[PDB]
């Protein structure tokens, strides 16, 4: 036998159902979520880090001059200078005349620490959905298994079959472009493909983790050495990666709506509570029993002792009962005005017991069924003072309803009386002739 | 900070985060004379109560003024038969006086 329903999506709150199979004793089942792990479909774009400039040893000549050539290197540079007359330690200083020799080539490549800290850019698409569920029905204990979310993929837990999803909404917390660094992500929605920005966020963009091309600029510039001392001055913009490190905005894990964290490795967006789920479960037929083996329940009386609406179980009521024989059978509230803390209760001859429940209404009016038997427990008013409540404009109190019906009735009475008087006046004239 | 039914969460330094579901507040009371019941029906929902009160007073006053206009019109209709009053005729013995 199988059963279908719709369940609101929330990680903590359980769900209690009571399946009916005519000619058999009812069975109740209890299902509770543990996770909701949205997973997107992603691909890498490139990585970036802090750069480093290196310079090979320059070359000079005691006389004459040479010319430098351009080589295929990322932001390669070379240039020549004139009239050096250099100097060395206790040396002849490598000059006798106008020198006019200087190489001063410059060279850019990735840093040695790029292997550890490095932003990554990504493109994002919808991807899959999956969760995990802990289950218990009849007398079987807690059983847990995971399952995808779509109205097609079965999964067996113990001896039951499950078909859940798809979700009621297509909402997601990600955008088309994201960036991942260190431990968290950001909606830095505008990386750049091949165009750097002279050190704003892209100035060293390795297409892969160990590529050999860095299609971005650093605005490197050379300078003329002075005072005849062998060195290679230069100048360049400071790395923009540092600047973005200093001015990162709010990380996504502190702005996501609906209160859902963000794991890293699969880019899990866990627990993001929204909407409802269509559920459909089948239980084996070996867990039912003949309807003539259960104690018949009759002569019921439910009395409300004390209650108060709060996020915890703040309601207690008692029931008096006349049994057929001793046994145990479950209890449940099909209506949603109040939730029943208890699930199943034992019964003795001439039963009389109590339970617990939460609610959200001043005057609870919930009606419960037990052991194939109905009973209304209209309760009373409860004094005022995270968990399952309705809050469906059903808080109109006795005085509130009293006043509203009073004013409505008064308005109706006066208008109808006036309408009657109009035709009362008219019919006289209609009779005068 | 302003918490609500949906709850709020915060962090501090290197301490792990924390959440609070602040609610359940009952300033006022729903029983007794109209004024205190109104103040409870006010403070319960911080603003939707207020807008509900404004709407309710508007609708009740417009209903009352419509009723009184209908009263006046019906009164005019009840005045109309007294066209026979200037005629100096037999009394009619009705809700109005006639010598």
Swiss-Prot record, chain B:
Give the positions of lipid attachment, kind S-palmitoyl cysteine. Answer: 78, 98-99
Q: Which residues lie on this side of the membrane: Cytoplasmic?
A: 76-99
Provide the record's note on post-translational modification. Palmitoylated via thioester bonds. These palmitoylations may induce disruption of the C-terminus transmembrane. This would result in the reorientation of E2 C-terminus from lumenal to cytoplasmic side. N-glycosylated.
TM segment ranges: 45-63
Subunit info here reads: Interacts with spike glycoprotein E1. Processing of the precursor of protein E3/E2 into E2 and E3 results in a heterodimer of the spike glycoproteins E2 and E1. Spike at virion surface are constituted of a trimer of E2-E1 heterodimers. Interacts with 6K protein. E2-E1 heterodimers interact with host VLDLR or LRP8/APOER2 to mediate viral entry. Interacts (via E2-A) with host VLDLR (via class A repeats); this interaction mediates viral entry into host cell. Interacts with host LRP8/APOER2 (via class A repeats); this interaction mediates viral entry into host cell.
Q: What does this protein do?
A: Plays a role in viral attachment to target host cell, by binding to the cell receptors VLDLR or LRP8/APOER2. Synthesized as a p62 precursor which is processed by furin at the cell membrane just before virion budding, giving rise to E2-E1 heterodimer. The p62-E1 heterodimer is stable, whereas E2-E1 is unstable and dissociate at low pH. p62 is processed at the last step, presumably to avoid E1 fusion activation before its final export to cell surface.
Name of protein: Spike glycoprotein E2
Q: Which residues of the full protein are shown?
A: 638 to 736 of 1239
């Amino acid at each position: 036998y199988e059963h279908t329903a719709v369940m609101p999506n929330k990680v903590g709150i359980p769900y209690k159902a009571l399946v009916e199979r005519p000619g058999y004793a009812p069975v109740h089942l209890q299902i509770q979520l543990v996770n909701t792990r949205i997973i997107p479909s992603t691909n890498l774009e490139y990585i970036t880090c802090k750069y480093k400039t290196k310079v090979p040893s320059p070359v000079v000549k005691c006389c004459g001059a040479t010319q430098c050539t351009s080589k295929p290197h990322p932001d390669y540079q070379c240039q020549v200078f004139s009239g050096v007359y250099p100097f060395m330690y206790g040396g002849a200083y490598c000059f006798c005349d106008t020198e006019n020799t200087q190489m001063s080539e410059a060279y850019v490549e990735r840093s040695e620490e790029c292997s550890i800290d490095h932003a990554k850019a990504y493109k994002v698409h919808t991807g899959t959905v999956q969760a995990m569920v802990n289950i218990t029905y009849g007398s079987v204990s807690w059983r847990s298994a995971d399952v995808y979310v779509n109205g097609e993929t079965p999964a067996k837990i113990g001896d039951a079959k499950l078909i859940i999803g798809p979700l009621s909404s297509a909402w997601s917390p990600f955008d088309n472009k994201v960036v991942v660094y260190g431990h968290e992500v950001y909606n830095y929605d505008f990386p750049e493909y091949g165009t750097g920005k002279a050190g704003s966020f892209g100035d060293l963009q390795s297409r892969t983790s160990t590529s050999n091309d860095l299609y971005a600029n650093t605005n490197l510039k050379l300078q003329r050495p002075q005072a005849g001392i062998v060195h290679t001055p230069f100048t360049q913009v400071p790395s923009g990666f540092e600047r973005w490190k200093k001015d990162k905005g709010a990380p996504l894990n502190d702005v996501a709506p609906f209160g859902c964290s963000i794991a890293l490795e699969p880019l899990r967006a866990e627990n993001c509570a929204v909407g409802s789920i269509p559920i459909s479960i089948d239980i084996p037929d070996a867990a039912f029993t003949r309807i003539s083996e259960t104690p018949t329940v009759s002569d019921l009386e439910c009395k409300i002792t004390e209650c108060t609406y709060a996020f915890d179980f703040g309601g207690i009521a008692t029931v008096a009962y006349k049994s057929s024989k001793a046994g145990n059978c479950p209890i449940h509230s099909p209506s949603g005005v109040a939730v029943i803390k208890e699930n199943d209760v034992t019964l003795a001859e001439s039963g009389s017991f109590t339970f617990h429940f939460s609610t959200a209404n001043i005057h609870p009016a919930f009606k419960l069924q037990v052991c194939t038997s109905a009973v209304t427990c209209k309760g009373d008013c409860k004094p005022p003072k995270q968990h399952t409540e309705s809050f469906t404009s059903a808080i109109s109190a006795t005085a509130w309803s009293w006043i509203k019906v009073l004013v409505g009735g008064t308005s109706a009475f006066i208008v109808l009386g006036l309408i009657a008087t109009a035709v009362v006046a008219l019919v006289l004239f209609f009779h005068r002739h | 900070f302003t918490v609500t039914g949906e709850g709020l969460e915060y962090t501090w330094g290197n301490h792990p985060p924390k959440r609070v579901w602040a609610q359940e507040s009952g300033e006022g009371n729903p029983h007794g004379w109209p004024h205190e019941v109104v103040v409870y029906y006010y403070n319960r929902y911080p603003l939707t109560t207020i807008i509900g009160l404004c709407t309710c007073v508007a609708i009740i006053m417009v209903s009352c003024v419509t009723s009184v206009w209908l009263l006046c019109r019906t009164r005019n209709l009840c005045i109309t038969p007294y066209k026979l009053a200037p005629n100096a005729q037999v009394p009619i013995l009705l809700a109005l006086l006639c010598c």
